[PDB]
Amino acid sequence: SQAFQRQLTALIGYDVTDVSNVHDDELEFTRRGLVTPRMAEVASRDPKLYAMHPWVTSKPLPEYLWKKIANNCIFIVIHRSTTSQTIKVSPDDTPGAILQSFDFVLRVCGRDEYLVGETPIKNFQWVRHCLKNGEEIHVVLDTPPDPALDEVRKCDRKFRVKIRGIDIPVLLTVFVEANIQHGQQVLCQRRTSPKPFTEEVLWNVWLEFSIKIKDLPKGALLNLQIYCGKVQLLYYVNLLLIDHRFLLRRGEYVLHMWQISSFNADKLTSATNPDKENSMSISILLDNAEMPNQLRKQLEAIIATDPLNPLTAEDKELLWHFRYESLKHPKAYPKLFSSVKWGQQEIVAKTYQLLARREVWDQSALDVGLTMQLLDCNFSDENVRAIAVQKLESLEDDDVLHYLLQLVQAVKFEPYHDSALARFLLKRGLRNKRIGHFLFWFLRSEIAQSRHYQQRFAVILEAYLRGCGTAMLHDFTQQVQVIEMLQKVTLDIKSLSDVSSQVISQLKQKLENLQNSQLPESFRVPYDPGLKAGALAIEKCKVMASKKKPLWLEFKCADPTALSNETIGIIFKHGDDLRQDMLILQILRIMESIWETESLDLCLLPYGCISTGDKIGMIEIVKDATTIAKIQQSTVGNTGAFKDEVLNHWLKEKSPTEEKFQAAVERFVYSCAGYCVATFVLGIGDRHNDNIMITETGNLFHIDFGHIERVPFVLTPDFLFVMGTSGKKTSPHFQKFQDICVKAYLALRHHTNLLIILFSMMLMTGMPQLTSKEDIEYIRDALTVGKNEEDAKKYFLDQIEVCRDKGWTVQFNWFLHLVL
Ligand SMILES: CC(=O)Nc1nc2ccc(-c3cnc(Cl)c(NS(=O)(=O)c4ccc(F)cc4)c3)cc2s1
């Protein structure tokens, strides 16, 4: 009867039950600790609302979508068997108000989405999406899905550590470095004598630290590092000094260490290397008045600075002395708690007194940017971090999905496997099938390709699955099977490597074979859990010309009520880290919803992209779209004598009518403006011509973000000749272009803090290469912190006037680079 546990293993892609790589019982304690939060949210959720999961928002409907509505009236076409009749509806009308307009529940045609619950129809996401693209809200009169399908299975000494020695099975002078750590701050540091580097080095040394046992804070790491020499860090490993039972660590440790290929999230992990046979190990032993004017200004200038501006000792001493004034400002919080001398018992006590009186904090409107900072690598105190998770509680489900990726990554900054943030995600996952779905893949993604955090994420996922219900479990099981069957086919085809013609039949042969053998004939599309894909479309399946040879696959829609003929196009790629692409795209989504708060819609295409396993995942195929290079290839040819008039020409020939050409050119100016701003800010602006795409309908969009004389971003004359210009001129559309860009840019600057943090966290948990202070401190320059609105406008307009002044130089330089 434990085959349920064996199933969970195969759904997770890691066995929680295994204990070959522990040196204590933290993981198991956290399994057993999560049972309560699991069963609480399970028991408290509404069965029917959980089944239908209405994807709803509570946000204002922006200016752009109102001016689309035909005067306080919205048409909704309802379907029976084949009896479609349209109905007049007012933005405020309830799903209930339309059910007694003419127990049956409304379901979107084609999708596994529902229009139910006490919110107006203007508050449903599906409706807002129809209007966005200008489409009609078709919906079937259905039976509510059965909740039964969702059912669940039921002391004043100084600290000291003895370094016995290091041991490596295989393989010129080496020394161990021991740091008492706390939130990236190193509190005390001791070194060994440097011995000769051989497969085994013994020291038998007591390293006396100056910090006392009482002064140790919970969440402090003993960080053991190995340097050789000209010095270089070669190996690292960590050990929580205070354990999950608030107990001081004691005894003998043989800890297997991580190697090395500046901040990186992997460097913080309490996980030990699972590879006993190849990794370096270490052997250790634990036995053991109210303020004046001039200063208020100084304090307020400090509070004003961006999250990345370093505080000096002077700044910190001031913040701490004025604890209580600093407390009256929610924005002082990250700076204030980074002024705490965490390696001093009485100070932390005072810090806790200060926390116990956070009336201003608790009453303030949620600031996601501010909250995030408290969950990054700079904070190891659980009580500090808990006030952040506290603030997240108020997020509506719609806003969790916006931040879900980075909150899931934020877990890599937690000292302990059991944390407020982990419980939060768990809770908010079990309450909403949608958050649940994505939470599953997000965790699975990291479990597959990261040893530093798989053990932890696996515990959190198992906790989630044990509460999602039989329906979800079946769905998940079905999704895994498919991508596991398909990934095998991708790896095999890549090995038969220009694309052969016989190899297309090789692919089509194996896809036919799977159609019978084991493949489930329907599954949820992981990047769009609304859509259920069914049987394949073998004729349309191929291998793309790309040298990473990905699978272009198309699927029939398994839902008969689907009111379309279009297949479901998924790319299957191996060879790249798609985790990076997810992050960028999710930031892109954040950028959009920001622009929504100011009634803008810059028509980005942040297509679906899920990293399913090790260096291999899947991607949404945008319909009726092609790359900019191919447009230049069909008129100009191979070598690329880039012609300025080809794009607008291509837009004309894909525009059916004059009516559609206006809205196409207009969607280009919008989408182009967004991608120029977004990429400039993220520093992924200077991009190859073949990495940018357009839809037949005007929508531009960048692809392949994981791909990473210069230029700010991509603004070329062929783009500009859709904006009545070349070299030196100004049209009514180019004025609009600048009028959208400069407003998009200072619009992001109204959210500087948030993007800075999101950027930091992205580099630390997802870009495992360089990421030093300097890497991160690019977005400060890009967003011109401190600079006024007027100066920054001229900064961005100069960027344009570099792309203008560069013409084709950079695109051309890519050609001599990539192609030749
Ligand atoms: C109608 C049509 O063709 N629509 C498309 N829609 C999308 C949506 C996304 C992507 C895409 C995005 N990111 C990465 Cl990393 C990739 N990787 S890839 O290897 O498939 C690829 C790398 C470059 C290159 F020029 C073509 C494909 C692919 C490609 C396409 S094609």
Side-chain angles (χ1 to χ4, degrees), residues 1-229 231-820:
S1 178
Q2 294 154 56
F4 168 66
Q5 171 65 66
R6 289 185 192 183
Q7 193 197 333
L8 292 154
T9 302
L11 263 196
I12 295 161
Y14 182 91
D15 50 355
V16 193
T17 50
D18 183 283
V19 283
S20 56
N21 186 38
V22 290
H23 61 246
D24 78 331
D25 58 278
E26 218 215 327
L27 292 164
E28 294 287 299
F29 183 93
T30 312
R31 288 181 63 183
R32 307 171 309 177
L34 291 172
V35 159
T36 298
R38 186 184 101 207
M39 288 168 172
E41 183 58 73
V42 160
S44 57
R45 76 193 177 201
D46 174 276
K48 297 158 194 196
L49 290 159
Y50 179 66
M52 286 170 300
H53 60 280
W55 182 15
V56 53
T57 181
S58 320
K59 289 153 210 311
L61 192 150
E63 280 187 60
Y64 58 82
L65 291 186
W66 274 111
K67 295 155 186 184
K68 302 260 185 170
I69 297 154
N71 283 350
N72 296 318
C73 182
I74 279 150
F75 282 54
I76 296 164
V77 196
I78 303 175
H79 305 248
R80 191 193 304 276
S81 202
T82 39
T83 319
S84 60
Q85 187 141 341
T86 318
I87 278 94
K88 288 182 184 180
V89 168
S90 170
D92 289 14
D93 301 352
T94 349
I98 320 169
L99 288 169
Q100 282 172 312
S101 200
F102 60 81
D103 292 350
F104 283 97
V105 159
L106 314 143
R107 174 179 70 90
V108 179
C109 292
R111 301 203 152 278
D112 211 80
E113 211 79 33
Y114 290 89
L115 300 177
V116 282
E118 261 59 79
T119 36
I121 41 93
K122 66 154 186 169
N123 282 5
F124 285 82
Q125 289 279 48
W126 181 247
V127 179
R128 302 206 173 185
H129 164 81
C130 301
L131 294 146
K132 203 175 196 278
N133 298 25
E135 288 187 317
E136 26 187 45
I137 317 160
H138 297 258
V139 57
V140 75
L141 197 78
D142 216 350
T143 307
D146 188 0
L149 302 157
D150 297 324
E151 203 213 316
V152 204
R153 202 174 188 255
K154 192 199 173 177
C155 191
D156 274 354
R157 274 211 226 96
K158 287 181 187 174
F159 171 89
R160 64 181 207 151
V161 49
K162 186 174 223 168
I163 304 305
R164 316 209 76 111
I166 59 164
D167 183 68
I168 176 85
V170 200
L171 193 84
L172 280 156
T173 54
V174 138
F175 71 89
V176 163
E177 196 178 71
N179 314 283
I180 316 276
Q181 278 218 23
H182 198 263
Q184 293 267 188
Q185 219 173 69
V186 40
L187 299 180
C188 219
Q189 177 182 98
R190 294 292 176 276
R191 271 163 176 168
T192 65
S193 62
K195 297 261 192 210
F197 193 23
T198 46
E199 303 93 296
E200 184 206 54
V201 189
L202 292 172
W203 266 280
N204 194 36
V205 171
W206 284 106
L207 285 175
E208 287 191 17
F209 283 91
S210 34
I211 180 160
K212 295 180 173 176
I213 279 90
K214 64 179 187 189
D215 282 309
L216 294 165
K218 197 193 174 203
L221 287 159
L222 175 64
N223 158 255
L224 297 168
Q225 300 200 296
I226 289 164
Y227 301 85
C228 71
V231 271
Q232 179 159 152
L233 178 65
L234 265 170
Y235 299 92
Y236 67 91
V237 77
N238 297 282
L239 177 67
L240 286 165
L241 293 187
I242 291 166
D243 87 335
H244 53 286
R245 301 205 153 85
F246 331 106
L247 295 172
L248 172 70
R249 195 129 276 164
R250 212 189 74 84
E252 293 283 353
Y253 292 90
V254 178
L255 301 170
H256 295 260
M257 311 173 68
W258 311 100
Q259 203 198 296
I260 302 292
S261 311
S262 62
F263 324 91
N264 187 304
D266 285 349
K267 284 179 84 180
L268 295 165
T269 186
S270 74
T272 58
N273 204 328
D275 189 346
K276 306 265 188 182
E277 205 172 355
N278 294 353
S279 66
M280 165 92 64
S281 97
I282 184 153
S283 302
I284 62 144
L285 171 64
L286 288 158
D287 168 38
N288 301 288
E290 259 269 295
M291 73 179 312
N293 183 33
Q294 184 69 72
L295 294 188
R296 154 150 291 98
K297 262 77 180 196
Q298 273 189 220
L299 185 59
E300 284 174 13
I302 284 157
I303 292 169
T305 57
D306 62 285
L308 282 173
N309 191 39
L311 294 173
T312 66
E314 288 62 33
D315 297 334
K316 292 190 206 180
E317 286 186 336
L318 192 80
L319 280 159
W320 176 256
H321 197 260
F322 299 115
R323 257 128 78 206
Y324 277 101
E325 191 59 45
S326 306
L327 201 74
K328 306 168 155 204
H329 295 69
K331 282 190 189 180
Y333 280 55
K335 313 210 129 79
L336 170 58
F337 298 112
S338 300
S339 293
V340 174
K341 277 165 172 176
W342 292 101
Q344 221 170 309
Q345 213 278 307
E346 299 193 353
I347 297 297
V348 170
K350 285 182 172 151
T351 323
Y352 287 10
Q353 276 172 338
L354 194 67
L355 281 177
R357 288 170 173 180
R358 88 299 256 277
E359 302 171 302
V360 175
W361 174 257
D362 296 346
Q363 282 153 12
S364 75
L366 170 62
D367 182 329
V368 162
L370 188 69
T371 336
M372 291 308 230
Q373 319 195 11
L374 290 181
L375 300 180
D376 68 26
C377 66
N378 303 294
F379 303 94
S380 264
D381 193 76
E382 300 188 326
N383 301 312
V384 172
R385 300 183 71 97
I387 77 159
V389 184
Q390 182 180 304
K391 267 297 146 92
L392 301 167
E393 294 293 0
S394 59
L395 288 163
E396 54 172 308
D397 286 314
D398 183 83
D399 264 5
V400 175
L401 288 164
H402 263 108
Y403 301 111
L404 189 56
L405 192 39
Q406 327 236 182
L407 302 159
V408 172
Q409 297 297 310
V411 162
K412 295 168 172 176
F413 300 126
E414 288 298 328
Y416 297 95
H417 303 317
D418 205 356
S419 58
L421 177 58
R423 276 152 193 252
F424 180 79
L425 296 168
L426 189 52
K427 212 164 71 198
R428 299 304 298 272
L430 288 176
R431 186 190 310 177
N432 192 330
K433 282 198 178 199
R434 192 174 172 86
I435 293 155
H437 170 93
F438 283 115
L439 174 63
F440 169 98
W441 291 99
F442 288 174
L443 294 169
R444 184 166 217 281
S445 182
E446 296 286 346
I447 283 152
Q449 53 218 321
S450 147
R451 284 97 57 263
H452 301 80
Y453 293 100
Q454 58 189 151
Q455 321 193 287
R456 174 188 285 195
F457 288 133
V459 176
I460 305 170
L461 182 48
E462 178 197 43
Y464 165 74
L465 296 154
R466 286 176 183 273
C468 61
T470 314
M472 305 271 312
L473 285 175
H474 176 91
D475 283 352
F476 290 131
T477 295
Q478 231 170 15
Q479 293 170 69
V480 172
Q481 282 196 45
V482 181
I483 71 101
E484 230 149 60
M485 290 178 205
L486 283 166
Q487 279 192 354
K488 288 194 181 186
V489 182
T490 303
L491 303 173
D492 283 7
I493 262 75
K494 208 170 175 180
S495 297
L496 288 165
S497 178
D498 295 352
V499 179
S500 171
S501 73
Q502 203 192 24
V503 93
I504 325 165
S505 288
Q506 288 266 345
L507 175 68
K508 286 171 181 173
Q509 197 65 72
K510 269 159 187 164
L511 289 166
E512 279 170 2
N513 271 231
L514 300 191
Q515 194 84 289
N516 347 306
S517 297
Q518 276 199 351
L519 188 83
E521 29 60 81
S522 81
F523 65 92
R524 265 166 218 283
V525 176
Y527 57 72
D528 181 354
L531 259 166
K532 269 202 186 179
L536 273 144
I538 300 87
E539 335 78 81
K540 282 108 211 70
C541 299
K542 62 202 192 209
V543 179
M544 291 176 84
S546 165
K547 282 161 189 169
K548 277 152 198 189
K549 307 202 176 287
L551 294 196
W552 169 294
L553 310 165
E554 315 201 47
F555 292 86
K556 271 156 183 165
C557 179
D559 215 308
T561 53
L563 284 163
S564 183
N565 37 74
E566 302 274 67
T567 52
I568 297 158
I570 308 163
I571 281 162
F572 245 98
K573 198 193 172 165
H574 165 244
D576 279 352
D577 187 45
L578 287 167
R579 281 187 304 167
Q580 296 190 10
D581 298 53
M582 298 194 302
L583 278 170
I584 300 288
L585 291 163
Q586 196 49 227
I587 286 194
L588 284 190
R589 293 188 183 90
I590 282 153
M591 281 183 172
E592 279 198 314
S593 96
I594 285 172
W595 287 327
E596 194 185 312
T597 80
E598 281 150 41
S599 285
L600 293 162
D601 181 335
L602 295 73
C603 301
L604 301 184
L605 274 178
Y607 53 89
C609 170
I610 302 298
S611 179
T612 51
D614 190 8
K615 286 178 176 162
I616 181 157
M618 75 215 296
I619 302 150
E620 185 189 347
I621 291 169
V622 178
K623 295 282 171 185
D624 316 296
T626 176
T627 77
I628 306 297
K630 197 162 188 188
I631 313 282
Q632 293 284 306
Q633 273 178 292
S634 76
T635 312
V636 183
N638 183 344
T639 36
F642 300 103
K643 282 172 192 187
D644 307 358
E645 44 72 29
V646 180
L647 207 88
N648 196 293
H649 194 248
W650 185 90
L651 288 176
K652 271 183 188 163
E653 60 159 291
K654 288 293 177 171
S655 287
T657 63
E658 169 56 32
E659 222 71 33
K660 287 154 183 188
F661 185 77
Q662 310 290 43
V665 174
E666 208 202 23
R667 213 185 191 102
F668 176 88
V669 181
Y670 276 54
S671 61
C672 177
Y675 277 96
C676 297
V677 181
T679 60
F680 174 67
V681 169
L682 298 183
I684 50 158
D686 193 335
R687 288 279 266 154
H688 342 75
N689 196 55
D690 35 354
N691 285 151
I692 306 174
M693 285 189 80
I694 196 170
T695 61
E696 292 177 14
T697 187
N699 219 120
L700 192 83
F701 66 98
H702 288 225
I703 58 161
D704 200 340
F705 306 101
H707 194 79
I708 324 145
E709 157 61 71
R710 307 161 219 172
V711 73
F713 51 94
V714 176
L715 180 66
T716 41
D718 69 312
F719 285 49
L720 298 150
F721 191 69
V722 189
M723 306 174 175
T725 307
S726 56
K728 275 182 167 187
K729 255 204 174 177
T730 329
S731 75
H733 273 288
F734 175 77
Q735 292 166 161
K736 198 166 71 179
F737 167 85
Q738 299 163 125
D739 188 36
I740 297 155
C741 288
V742 187
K743 292 183 169 159
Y745 177 45
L746 58 91
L748 296 180
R749 294 169 90 271
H750 305 144
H751 285 267
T752 300
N753 278 38
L754 173 66
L755 305 168
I756 284 185
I757 289 296
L758 288 174
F759 188 82
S760 264
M761 291 196 178
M762 180 186 72
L763 292 194
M764 293 186 284
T765 68
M767 275 65 183
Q769 39 262 7
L770 274 62
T771 75
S772 59
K773 311 160 186 296
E774 303 84 43
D775 296 80
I776 302 168
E777 278 144 61
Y778 163 92
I779 196 156
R780 277 161 77 166
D781 303 309
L783 280 172
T784 50
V785 203
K787 307 287 179 175
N788 50 69
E789 274 211 15
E790 300 66 34
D791 203 305
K793 158 203 171 171
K794 295 176 196 177
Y795 182 77
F796 194 80
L797 281 164
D798 266 327
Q799 312 298 335
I800 291 171
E801 285 291 293
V802 166
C803 297
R804 298 282 285 110
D805 301 23
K806 289 285 188 175
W808 285 115
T809 295
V810 199
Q811 290 295 352
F812 193 90
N813 282 338
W814 281 121
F815 208 91
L816 311 161
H817 198 95
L818 292 187
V819 189
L820 308 146

